[PDB]
Amino acid sequence: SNNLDSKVGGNYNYLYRLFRKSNLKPFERDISTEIYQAGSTPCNGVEGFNCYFPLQSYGFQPTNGVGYQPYRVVVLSFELLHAPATVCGPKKSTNLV
Amino acid sequence: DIVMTQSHKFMSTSVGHRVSITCKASQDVGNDVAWYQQKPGQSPKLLIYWASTRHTGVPDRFTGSGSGTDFTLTISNVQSEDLADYFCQQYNRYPYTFGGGTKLEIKRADAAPTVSIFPPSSEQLTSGGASVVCFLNNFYPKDINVKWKIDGSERQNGVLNSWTDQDSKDSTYSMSSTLTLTKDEYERHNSYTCEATHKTSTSPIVKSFNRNE
Amino acid sequence: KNIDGYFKIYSKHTPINLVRDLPQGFSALEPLVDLPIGINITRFQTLLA
């Protein structure tokens, strides 16, 4: 979707977290847009004082290579839990033998 | 460029407590730990040189510890005259690249401000300028709410604030605001109102003065 | 318990003759529902009437 979602000069409207103190669990989102510290040196928010800040935007460019093109990925999260399954596949139900 | 990474950019310590500022420097200076003492309106002075000896005029309450990249300026019994900005630096060679800095604040109780509305002179209207004078002194803290009322109408544009540092005598604050007005905008209004909102009393200080006196 | 964001609820109801202490008996629990919450739970409280 390099002709619809990307913009000329860089679509810097969306952000994403880069570094975190701990790993995330599945089916968990991080909507916290605050900036945290990286190492032992306290930087306290804004950019400066030599910290690895996780603030980074998307480099979407339509006139660039295929490595930076925006891709509309829809993750079909299929799973098998302890609940009784109802969402089956397109198979014709036969009789009982 | 050498970036002097400091822990805190703004602190506050009242009288009787100990303030510890640890500046994690990105360079290894060894025993060359130096600090500053910047008075408001005066020249800066040396506070601690070589991390073990104080300057002439520095009292015994200002001590120091640490060496190299890890050092902590141990300051105990902070008084009202200890208002100074501390920079992590070195006295070995050039250039002197500094960092952000840490401002010290002495905590106290709140105080009621004094509002005095003064009209501009008649000779300023000949050139085509006007300035509404409203002063606010002896208040705490610095986050005060000053509103402008021009004939009952609230005005937000054309407000130029002027803030100062902490006082050294009784640790008070002072902030002024000048309303920039032209010749035509001043002659169409008569009564001005400068109000100050404080927390020491439920009745705010409201002052008014007529242009015709 | 919460394992990888998948919360499990095990329910069991049985009568007993108890007054004060802990019943030193034996019982087997059964699962009732499954809640894939996907969130982190570190502390909790107890709701009482």
Side-chain angles (χ1 to χ4, degrees):
Chain A
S1 62
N2 47 4
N3 301 330
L4 300 179
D5 298 331
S6 66
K7 297 181 179 181
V8 180
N11 185 25
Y12 299 148
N13 300 330
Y14 294 150
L15 303 174
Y16 73 104
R17 301 301 300 269
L18 181 61
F19 293 148
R20 204 183 180 272
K21 302 299 180 179
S22 300
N23 299 330
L24 289 183
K25 294 300 180 180
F27 294 151
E28 184 181 4
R29 59 180 180 180
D30 192 12
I31 61 178
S32 180
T33 60
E34 299 291 330
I35 307 178
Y36 298 147
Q37 299 181 359
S40 60
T41 60
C43 291
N44 298 334
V46 300
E47 185 179 0
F49 289 157
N50 300 332
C51 284
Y52 294 151
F53 301 96
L55 180 61
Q56 189 69 29
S57 53
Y58 288 148
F60 292 153
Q61 181 180 0
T63 60
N64 212 17
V66 298
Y68 292 148
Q69 292 180 359
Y71 288 157
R72 292 182 178 181
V73 37
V74 182
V75 179
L76 300 179
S77 300
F78 297 153
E79 59 181 0
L80 180 63
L81 300 179
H82 293 172
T86 53
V87 190
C88 307
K91 184 61 180 180
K92 302 179 181 180
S93 179
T94 55
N95 43 13
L96 179 62
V97 178
Chain B
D1 300 330
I2 300 299
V3 183
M4 306 302 298
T5 296
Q6 207 170 354
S7 181
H8 297 76
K9 302 180 181 181
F10 183 77
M11 291 297 300
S12 186
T13 303
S14 59
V15 184
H17 297 265
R18 181 183 301 180
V19 37
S20 300
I21 300 178
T22 301
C23 193
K24 297 296 183 179
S26 60
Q27 55 178 356
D28 193 11
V29 298
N31 300 330
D32 194 12
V33 180
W35 298 94
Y36 266 153
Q37 184 180 0
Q38 298 184 347
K39 299 181 179 180
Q42 298 293 329
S43 60
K45 298 179 181 180
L46 178 56
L47 182 64
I48 288 297
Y49 56 93
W50 294 348
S52 60
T53 318
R54 58 181 181 89
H55 204 262
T56 300
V58 177
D60 300 330
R61 63 177 184 266
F62 296 146
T63 59
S65 60
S67 60
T69 62
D70 192 14
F71 46 88
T72 301
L73 186 60
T74 300
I75 295 178
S76 300
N77 301 330
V78 183
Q79 301 291 331
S80 60
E81 300 180 0
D82 302 333
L83 177 62
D85 297 327
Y86 305 137
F87 290 155
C88 332
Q89 59 175 354
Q90 41 85 20
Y91 284 152
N92 205 104
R93 61 180 57 183
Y94 290 147
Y96 288 157
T97 307
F98 302 142
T102 299
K103 185 180 181 60
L104 188 58
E105 186 181 4
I106 294 102
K107 300 180 180 180
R108 60 172 300 181
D110 300 330
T114 301
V115 183
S116 300
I117 162 179
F118 292 141
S121 59
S122 60
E123 299 183 5
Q124 299 180 0
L125 300 181
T126 310
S127 60
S131 296
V132 186
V133 177
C134 283
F135 289 145
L136 291 90
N137 298 324
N138 300 330
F139 63 98
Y140 188 81
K142 60 180 180 60
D143 301 330
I144 210 179
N145 300 330
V146 36
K147 300 181 61 180
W148 291 86
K149 296 182 178 182
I150 305 179
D151 296 328
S153 179
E154 183 180 0
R155 183 61 180 180
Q156 300 180 0
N157 300 330
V159 182
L160 302 177
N161 299 330
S162 302
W163 58 273
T164 55
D165 211 357
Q166 191 178 10
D167 197 68
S168 60
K169 179 181 180 180
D170 48 354
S171 300
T172 54
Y173 291 153
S174 60
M175 184 181 300
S176 60
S177 298
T178 301
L179 180 60
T180 300
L181 295 180
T182 63
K183 182 183 180 300
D184 185 70
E185 295 179 359
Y186 183 75
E187 297 182 0
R188 294 181 178 270
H189 300 281
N190 302 330
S191 180
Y192 294 148
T193 302
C194 283
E195 300 181 1
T197 301
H198 55 265
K199 300 180 180 180
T200 60
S201 180
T202 60
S203 180
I205 304 299
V206 181
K207 299 296 296 180
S208 300
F209 193 76
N210 194 20
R211 192 182 63 91
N212 298 330
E213 190 181 354
Chain C
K1 60 180 180 180
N2 187 25
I3 301 178
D4 299 330
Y6 294 151
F7 194 81
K8 296 299 183 301
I9 296 181
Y10 303 141
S11 59
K12 179 58 180 180
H13 189 198
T14 162
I16 209 61
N17 184 24
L18 198 268
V19 178
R20 183 183 62 179
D21 300 329
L22 177 73
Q24 314 293 329
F26 187 77
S27 180
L29 275 77
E30 295 179 0
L32 180 61
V33 281
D34 192 13
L35 299 181
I37 42 176
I39 61 178
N40 305 334
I41 304 175
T42 64
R43 295 179 180 180
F44 69 100
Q45 287 181 348
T46 301
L47 179 61
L48 298 178

